[PDB]
Symmetry: D2
Subunit: 400 residues, 4 copies
């Protein structure tokens, strides 16, 4: 089994040369072909998925189901990626140096992307589409609980690859169900350049401890909205109504004015409120309840904490948060800009809902995942996250 994965790795590396070379038109043609194939086998796909969904119930299961609406979404997603600009081969900043050479960078694919996913058989299409368009070979590793759906989709990918003239190995499915496959895959550093997990925190914690191949991922997010004492209450109500706020931080000076309509609005929608001692007093005096005591671990449910002001807010966020998405509500210009600069999170917001931190809202036109890491790709990740910049030199015979 350690020779099978090695073989998969070798074939990926070799396939990666072909897809790297493939023109914009060929890649888009592959994608459109996979799209039409799905429109064609809608029934067989709906049928196969049902077999999977039935054995599922017979022992999340939502995210496993391919409704007519999910297929439509996968197809529409294929055509979106086709519509996206082809980022490969682009040259930038080709400047002359005193020495005579001209130096710039080229955007090229990473090469080989490993996708490890649980349920979510749509990942089979959505992940591979993005990798393919960005010129990479893809290694797919789904979960047992979706064998037939993934197998069926992976064959349609191959059909699209065949239609475009591309090698079948442009997309490989790890066919086994053997446990040690993932262990080998996340350690296959010669042949795999990055892993994109699409599972729960349980799997993501395993990979974090074990993987030697770099990953694009976020350990599930604790996100904050800090309501400053120079907040507009009106903005705070609109704004505060993986990137969903889990903790509301409110400056002491404005808590009564803000927490009264906020807590009341949240209560009416059925949200449980976990509050620190100060917030409890503010909410009780406003007649808003019931309320649950917040523990230190707390840092359909919302945690609420009172802070002295912006210094304590930034410090709490950088210390306890997941560095995913965090927002400030304030009318004070310097405090707004300070927050943007100092809050060390993947996306930082002034007077806007934390829900806006996703690839489509941000204009990336896609989202392979969301990264809370500092290096390479951070925040919502689009096509570019699956590419690299190398230096290219237009010379004229210069020696050194």
């Amino acid at each position: 089994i350690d020779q099978y994965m090695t073989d998969v790795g070798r074939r990926a590396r070799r396939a990666s040369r072909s897809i790297a070379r493939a023109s914009t038109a060929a890649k888009n043609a592959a994608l459109e072909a996979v799209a039409r194939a799905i429109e064609r086998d809608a029934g067989a796909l709906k049928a196969a998925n049902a077999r999977d969904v039935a054995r599922a119930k017979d022992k999340f299961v939502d995210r496993l189901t391919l409704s007519d609406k999910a297929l439509k979404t996968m197809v529409e997603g294929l055509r979106q990626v086709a519509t996206l600009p082809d980022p490969i081969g682009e040259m930038s900043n080709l400047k002359y140096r005193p020495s005579g050479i001209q130096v710039g960078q080229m955007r090229v694919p990473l090469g080989v992307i490993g996708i490890i996913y649980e349920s979510r058989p749509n990942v089979t299409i959505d992940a591979a589409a993005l990798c393919l368009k960005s010129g990479n070979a893809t290694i797919l590793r789904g979960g047992s609980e979706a064998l037939e759906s993934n197998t069926a989709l992976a064959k349609l990918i191959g059909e699209g690859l065949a239609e475009a003239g591309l090698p079948q190995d442009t997309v490989q499915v790890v066919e086994t169900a053997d446990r040690a496959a993932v262990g080998r895959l996340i350690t296959m550093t010669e042949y795999v350049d990055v892993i994109v997990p699409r599972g729960g925190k349980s799997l993501i914690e395993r990979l974090i401890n074990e993987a030697r191949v770099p990953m694009i991922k976020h350990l599930d997010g604790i996100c904050h909205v800090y309501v400053d004492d120079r907040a507009s209450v009106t903005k705070a109500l609109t704004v505060c109504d993986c990137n969903t706020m889990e903790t509301l931080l409110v400056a002491r000076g404005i808590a009564p004015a803000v927490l009264s309509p906020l807590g009341r609005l949240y209560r009416e929608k059925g949200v449980e409120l976990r509050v620190d001692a100060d917030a409890r007093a503010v909410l009780e005096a406003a007649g808003v309840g019931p309320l649950v005591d917040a523990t230190d671990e707390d840092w359909p449910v919302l945690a609420i904490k009172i802070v002295d002001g912006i210094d304590a807010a930034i410090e709490h966020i950088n210390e306890y948060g997941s560095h995913h998405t965090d927002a400030i509500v304030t009318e004070d210009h310097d405090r707004a800009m300070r927050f943007l600069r100092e809050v060390d999170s993947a996306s930082v917001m002034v007077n806007a809902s934390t829900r806006f931190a996703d690839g489509f809202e941000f204009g990336l036109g896609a989202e392979i995942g969301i990264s809370n890491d500092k290096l390479h790709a951070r925040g919502p990740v689009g096509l570019e996250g699956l590419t690299s910049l190398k230096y290219v030199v237009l010379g004229h015979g210069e020696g050194r």
Copy 2:
């Protein structure tokens, strides 16, 4: 005790990072200038300490010139600090702030990574050079230098601390590991809570041991072959000027042009005492050119290849993906080589030796990367930074 120490250093770096990330351009540049002055006319303590390192070394042997802080080394070191001060501050820069249909305005801000760990050999100069770059890019630094340079590096750390204090920055912005115990290295590269990236420099054996023990990501160069491929449509003249870490280790020559090219190239190299390791075809061409002696397989490997397709395959298979070049006058082949050669720097008609932070216009070189993610090729200030998203909103909810 040594775990407790490295943990403490970690926590201190993380805490200091908030201040240095907040620091103004003027304050960081002032810090650099103060360290420069503090090295000037306080060079005596520096030299005395270095003398002790150099003496403990000789009484063991070998390297000593690399370890030695001559007047020249200090002059270079001081000039470098000032050069780093002249570099534009990349921190806090906002770019591509665009309105979206939803009404929000979304762009990116360049920010420091936070804490950089630097691991190096026994050239004391690196202490100042690496720290200058990390500091200018708004990061806290932890430095572990070679154990044979420990007293020099400790003496340099004190001057850095004084410069920092003069500019109102905290002492812990820069920390030099005060122990020679190598177990500190294992700690530093596994300290993921507190350290954001490791920048290791040194030989392959060091780099290799670091690679399979580290859990903190690294910006590094795992050494190996750099190539120059001389195409059959090469200009012989350009081949001679071009082909004379980023040094050409292997020469690949297209079959069609081998006699015309290997004859003068072989002489060029044999007239510098460079050894020629040759495959069978190259041996034949070189013997017929009267160029020897030759060794079968300061050294150059030489191989005959059929043409460009084989060259690209060879380089992508056998090379270190560091620096590789083609000599050709053919436009499509030049562009193909640039696109398909999967190296950190790829060149058309230029020496692989140009793959350098200063040659490339970065004004700095913290290191070289043959990695694909984050930073690739020679790495300057930007490699010690991150891009995050920033949103200028107006109260929008989704």
Copy 3:
């Protein structure tokens, strides 16, 4: 009163530009989509209005090409509608901030992209310009002043009323788009001199109208007088590439061929062009080459042929230096191409040929806003300043510096 009238239009345009410059992306796109649906709605009525214009036109016996450009068929209409939704789809360029960098002094300085303000559009025939130009101006946050020709009166009027419908539907001031209503020829002269109120002018007509504006305008223009475009076939050209590129404004008016490759290239190219009914105007050397190959008939080229304009001028040159000099001397600096396999020659040509678009091994017919990825085309510019080549939304915007300070004094 033409002065009173036109000055009033200018002040109204300035006032309205303030609103449209502030307009959110959503409001601008809603305005475009409204106009598009409105055209879909009144398609029959618009075609009926256009037929009255065409009938009145063919009565005067106007140039068939002028009349064919006047004609709004279903295809033209659908095409305008597509254009509206294309423009709505384009990213909103306005208000974007870039390169906001800290300086040693402590300030942070960058640039903001903003609208020019007020755009004057002057057009003959082509009633579709009423919609297409207004759309681009509007999306880029500008006020527009439209001056269309007399022969499209009913069409332009109908189309502009629909624009107004869209403005109102999106909450934009009606004066965001104004039409110059009088046919008085004096209005054009005022418009191109109304330097206080109009920031740039985009003319779309022939070389007849452009000539007047060029000599009379004081307001800056985005335009191109004539397209004398070249393909130079280097002696190191791939013959195959030469054949594909040279067979394929924008169109090759002059073919330059290196002496060394002329028999290999001109012989199949000359035959190819004559099998298309293209007149070949040739220099002495190309004539001998073509006569040699049996390609005919041929007209002698005059030196005015190198500066003129189904006719193709052919000239033999020694090589790339002669070719570059000829292009820079006689060309219109619009679009020019080299066919060569030699890398250094290819890069020299890109560098030294002072045209708006320079091509290596590609047909000059690719020099085009859509082919270039601009997603739009307000016009093609052969000027050096501000906008050059095909011009998209950004051509109708300006960059200004913006500074985020902290109380710094100097």
Copy 4:
């Protein structure tokens, strides 16, 4: 003869422009360094011409005087221009298109730059240095009262060019005071691509109405600082202490808190205060004087400070866009939305939040140069550096693709 001479000058500039556009970074920087050494060697023969010029008002004579501090500054400038990156020939955004072609842009020189300037001999060198560095040929018409010194500088620029192997005609200085040269230069559309005029508003205004060649210029006028009612008084004082503030706009609500310490500051520094009725009342209540009644003309006409009270930001923005020269204008405010609004809506070349208008400057903005300042909308706006003397054209890297 003046006419034949000017045409010849144009033709030579066009011919030279090919060589300089092509010239490498090394050759251009070497020309610069060579000029800088030729000034160091022929300094005596140079300072003598200046003397025979300075002899032949005030402080016209000081600005005209090639002091041994201006010759250092001029020489340092050459070397400074040499350190600047070479903007020329850069290719950017070379992207593949679905058709298979690859399309990007290349930055190239405008070609031939006309420089028209006063009797400050340093401009001769400064402006030529910038034009040369950016790959352009230059034609310089300086003040007639510096004609001998500029003729002296011309010979030395010539030296530098020759050393570098660049054509002499890369830089031509007009060898006559005949003002007809100016009329020709600003109409030489065949040979000159842009004019960079530098002087007083009168001259600039003539050129504007007469020039057919495009210009990078600024028609001087009012720059404003608006102090909003949510301004920090502290920031207002440091901020409110050719981009000089000619008019101060103060929100009615903050006027006594700001105008009182500010007025005192100005009066101590000797500034005439021309005030509207409302500012009069506030300043007089604060014991600041004397004051002069502002006219309606004072809001349009450029040591005086004009001070106006406005209701708030809407009235300020409107006043600035109406009366200003669209050069540089600033807001002092702590309110985020108001700060961003001002940046967006104030249609000036440089707009500032909580920073002095005096920062509107090429060096302050990081351009490393200033060929001039522009308050026009097209091409170049604000302080103009090397890039303003360049153009972007499209370049296509193709593979033999056809399209009919």
